[PDB]
Amino acid sequence: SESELDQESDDSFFNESESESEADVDSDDSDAKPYGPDWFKKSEFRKQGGGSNKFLKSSNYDSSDEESDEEDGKKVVKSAKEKLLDEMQDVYNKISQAENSDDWLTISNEFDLISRLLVRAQQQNWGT
């Protein structure tokens, strides 16, 4: 059995598909409004109807409303009574006693115009 051979042959080798080239990477970040007007200044706002209020009350005249709406008296001692005695002789005549309990209404219905001290003598609105 005889045969022959040869080594001048090939079937596979390297081959490139690329050569001169380049590449890169990039990134970015920012913060601002996309649109819309605005102001940086702060402030505060307030108003009122003049800061006060009026009423329909008025001075006395010929028409009236009521003659009695309270107890007829309460007694009085050690007060503005002690600077009101001896100023007069007729409407003072009960004031030197002041314990009568039931005549103080009748006198206060005229003392409104005689003396504002008599109202203070019976009421004693000093803050106690």
Curated annotation (Swiss-Prot):
Residues 1-75 are annotated as: Disordered. It comes from the Eukaryota. The modification Phosphoserine is found at S63, S64, S68. It is found in: Cytoplasm. Disulfide bonds: none annotated. Residues 3-29 have a biased composition (Acidic residues). Belongs to the eIF-3 subunit C family. Component of the eukaryotic translation initiation factor 3 (eIF-3) complex, which is involved in protein synthesis of a specialized repertoire of mRNAs and, together with other initiation factors, stimulates binding of mRNA and methionyl-tRNAi to the 40S ribosome. The eIF-3 complex specifically targets and initiates translation of a subset of mRNAs involved in cell proliferation. Present with 78900 molecules/cell in log phase SD medium. The eukaryotic translation initiation factor 3 (eIF-3) core complex is composed of TIF32, PRT1, NIP1, TIF34 and TIF35. A subcomplex of TIF32, NIP1 and PRT1 mediates the interaction with eIF-1, TIF5/eIF-5 and HCR1. The factors eIF-1, eIF-2, eIF-3, TIF5/eIF-5 and methionyl-tRNAi form a multifactor complex (MFC) that may bind to the 40S ribosome. TIF32, NIP1 and TIF5/eIF-5 comprise a minimal 40S-ribosome-binding unit. NIP1 interacts with TIF5/eIF-5 and SUI1. This is Eukaryotic translation initiation factor 3 subunit C. It comes from Saccharomyces cerevisiae (strain ATCC 204508 / S288c) (Baker's yeast). The gene is NIP1. The chain holds residues 36 to 163 of 812 of the full protein.
